[PDB]
Structures are given as C-alpha cells and as structure tokens.
Design a protein around this nucleic acid. Structure first.
Length: 209
DNA sequence: CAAACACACCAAACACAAGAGCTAATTGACTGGCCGTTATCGATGTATATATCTGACACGTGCCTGGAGACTAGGGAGTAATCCCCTTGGC
C-alpha cells in the first residue's frame, strides 16, 4: 500500500522523535508533534518507489548538554537485514566520533546479525527496533508509569541512604520494552513513580540486571 | 559443502491434587537338603518258663530159690517077758 505505508512511516518517525526527546537529546518542539500533512508535503507521500524512500528520512540528533554526542536512526530496506548492511553502516559511522545509533528493521534481523551487533558493543553502541514495536509509544500507556533514568551520583546517594546494597534492589531485565526504550544498560537504576491509591504517590527503584 | 543458531515438532518425565478427626477388619510363608535328637528296628545276650531226657524213690509185677503139703513105703523106734549076770548088802 501507499497511503498506509506513509502513515506508518510518519508514526514511526514521531515515535522515534518522542523517544529521543525522552532520553535527553534536544529536538524541535515542531518535529516532536508534527502532523502528517507537513510530512507528506516534506517528503512526497509516494513511498511506493518514490521520494519518501527509506534511508533518506534518517535523523541525527545531538544530546542536550553534550553537543558532541549524537546517534543515528537508520532504516534499512532489506526486510531480513543481514550483517553486510550493519557492517557498512558501522563503517560509515566510524568516520565521525558518534558512538550510539538505533536501527529500525522491517522484519527481525537474522540471528547471525545479533552476534555482530553485540560484538561491536563496547566500541559502538547500536540497538534494533521493529517498526511494529515503534508504531505506538508505550510510555504514554495508562499502565506504564513514568520512568526516570537516574545518574550514578544519585544512585550512590540512594544506596548510602538506605544502607542497602544495590544487589538488594528489585530487578528489571534489559530486554524489557521500557528498558530498551530508555536505552538503559546493565548496572543502572531506573526510578519509578506510581500513583498510589493509598498514599497518593509512591516512588520505587529498579536496578537493571 | 559444512557449520552456526533458530523454530516447530516429537518424545520423555515430575509433581501436585484442603485441613484433618474417628472407627472397623485381612494379611499370622513355604519344599527341600541337611545336621542333630530321638524313636524305632535289629543282634546278642542272659534270666526265666517250658519240654525232653536221666537219676532216685515209690508202688507193682515177676523169675527164681528155697520151703512147704499130702501121700506113700518100709523100717526105725519101741511094749511086754525072760534070763541070769552082777550089784548091793551082811557078819
């Protein structure tokens, strides 16, 4: 389809922009909530072998406080992305000092690809998202409360306040969709704020592991 | 072509099935070989009971020796007279 594909692309882009904004990267208040009309008028609304073709709508955004830190958002055309594509992406990334990135794959990448992805991990952080997982922004959902990634200093402050070993805090595996959304990694604590029906508000913490 | 992982399927197990409380009744091992005790069958008697034969005592029959009976023959023992030898007796 044409119209549906354009709608899907616009939704994916909006989701990614909201995600980057949540993480901390600075983004236009315009593109954060741009409707679909300007999207059509910008790209062409002819994804079917036309102007709005993938890999052309990628967006690079720099962090809020560290203008030196950016992250790509690729959109490979291969339904079953291989390793060669990620290989060339990483090579082309290597020219700049960028370290983080985000891959949007049509369909699930082959298992051989995940091995390569993790292999380059310490040097170039890159993670994957299925468009099917990006068509909706979970963090807005009624059930999913509000997360706040904590800085190391305050994590130490918390642990020293409650005299509690970080091993004793609750756990949240990295695979969790909220974790992958925020880009948290192992050994890092996420603050959770829930409306408590018996206490108004209740704040808890979860160490990723 | 060979090796990596992933998925679907097939095949194989684990553990659970509320808290308990009371009462009743069915099961009470068994062939066989073998040793160890003891009951039984058998020989090798010596003691007692009974049968055959021999010895001593008893009653009975008997062969043999000597004794006894009737009768006889014929002669031994024995009256009645006589002589006169011899004894007892005498002065």
């Amino acid at each position: 389809d044409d119209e549906e594909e354009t709608y899907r692309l616009w939704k994916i882009r909006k989701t990614i922009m909201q995600l980057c904004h949540d993480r901390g990267y600075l983004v236009t208040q315009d593109e954060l909530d741009q409707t679909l009309e300007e999207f059509k008028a910008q790209f062409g609304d002819k994804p079917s072998e036309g102007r709005p073709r993938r890999t052309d709508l990628t967006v690079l955004v720099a962090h809020n406080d560290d203008p030196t830190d950016q992250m790509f958002v690729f959109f490979p055309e291969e339904p079953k992305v291989g390793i060669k594509t990620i290989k060339v992406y990483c090579q082309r990334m290597q020219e700049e000092n960028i370290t983080r990135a985000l891959i949007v794959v049509q369909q699930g990448m082959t298992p051989s690809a995940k091995q390569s992805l993790v292999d380059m991990a310490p040097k170039y952080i890159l993670e994957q998202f299925l468009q099917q997982e990006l068509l909706i922004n979970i963090t807005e959902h009624e059930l999913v409360p509000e997360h706040v990634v904590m800085t190391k200093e305050e994590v130490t402050e918390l642990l020293a306040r409650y005299k509690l070993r970080e091993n004793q805090l609750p756990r949240i595996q990295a695979g969790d969709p909220v974790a992958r959304y925020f880009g948290i990694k192992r050994g890092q604590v996420v603050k959770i704020i829930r409306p408590s029906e018996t206490a108004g508000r209740y704040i808890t913490y979860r160490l990723v592991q």
